[PDB]
Amino acid sequence: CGKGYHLMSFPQSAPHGVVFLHVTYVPAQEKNFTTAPAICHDGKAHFPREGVFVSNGTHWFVTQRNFYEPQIITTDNTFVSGNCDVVIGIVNNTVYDPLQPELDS
Amino acid sequence: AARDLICAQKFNGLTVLPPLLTDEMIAQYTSALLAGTITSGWTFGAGAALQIPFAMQMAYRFNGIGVTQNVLYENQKLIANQFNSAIGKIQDSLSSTAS
Numbered sequence: 001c002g003k004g005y006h007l008m009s010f011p012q013s014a015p016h017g018v019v020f021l022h023v024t025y026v027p028a029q030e031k032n033f034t035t036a037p038a039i040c041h042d043g044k045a046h047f048p049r050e051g052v053f054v055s056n057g058t059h060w061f062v063t064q065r066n067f068y069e070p071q072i073i074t075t076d077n078t079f080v081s082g083n084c085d086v087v088i089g090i091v092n093n094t095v096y097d098p099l100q101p102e103l104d105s
Numbered sequence: 106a107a108r109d110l111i112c113a114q115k116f117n118g119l120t121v122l123p124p125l126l127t128d129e130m131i132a133q134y135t136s137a138l139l140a141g142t143i144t145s146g147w148t149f150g151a152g153a154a155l156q157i158p159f160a161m162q163m164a165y166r167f168n169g170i171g172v173t174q175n176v177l178y179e180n181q182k183l184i185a186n187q188f189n190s191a192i193g194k195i196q197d198s199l200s201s202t203a204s
């Protein structure tokens with residue numbers, strides 16, 4: 001169903017045949033980022049639920065894979081599995097908790 | 106020595122034509138496909154090739170089949186060793202078995 005990520009298709013009739021118009025999705029403009037498999041925080045390893053950890057040089061974000069939409073790394077979009085001693089390439093960062101500012105107010 | 110079968114075929118009007126793509130170009134296409142698959146993943150089949158580390162690409166492949174991606178990050182050395190042993194077994198079975 002065409003080249004790219006398939007979205008739509010429309011048929012047309014032709015003499016002794018059929019013509020498919022395939023509507024597909026192609027990524028266009030890219031950028032380089034520094035990436036990590038996991039994040040070490042409080043002696044724990046955080047992995048993204050869906051997406052990927054990226055960094056522009058200073059801060060770390062989590063984003064979806066097929067579009068650059070960075071977000072603040074939070075316990076809502078990450079899950080915890082083990083400590084930091086078994087993952088090759090784990091980095092040190094902080095993980096935001098939404099319950100802590102709501103507790104203090 | 107003696108007359109070949111190929112000369113007897115050629116002396117009666119039967120000719121074998123060469124293919125358009127030589128084996129060097131087939132190997133070049135295969136090498137390009139391997140390099141794109143190893144470096145980029147499946148992103149080179151939908152447009153421009155986008156680089157990713159191979160461990161993170163394999164974690165994407167683990168998430169595709171229903172296994173959570175921390176399994177690879179905790180058993181990466183075992184998974185790499187099993188892959189290397191399987192490739193060596195393919196090597197040995199191709200060196201021994203001819204059928």
Ligand SMILES: *[C@@H]1O[C@H](CO)[C@@H](O)[C@H](O)[C@H]1NC(C)=O
Nearest residue numbers: 029030031032033154155156
């Ligand atoms: C990313 O880095 C590579 C290597 O340094 C460079 O060739 C490329 O232009 C950079 N930018 C993009 C968008 O790929």
Ligand SMILES: *[C@@H]1O[C@H](CO)[C@@H](O)[C@H](O)[C@H]1NC(C)=O
Nearest residue numbers: 040042043084090091092093
């Ligand atoms: C991350 O922090 C720990 C202590 O919390 C430290 O031992 C470790 O070296 C740090 N990692 C890096 C890459 O600096």
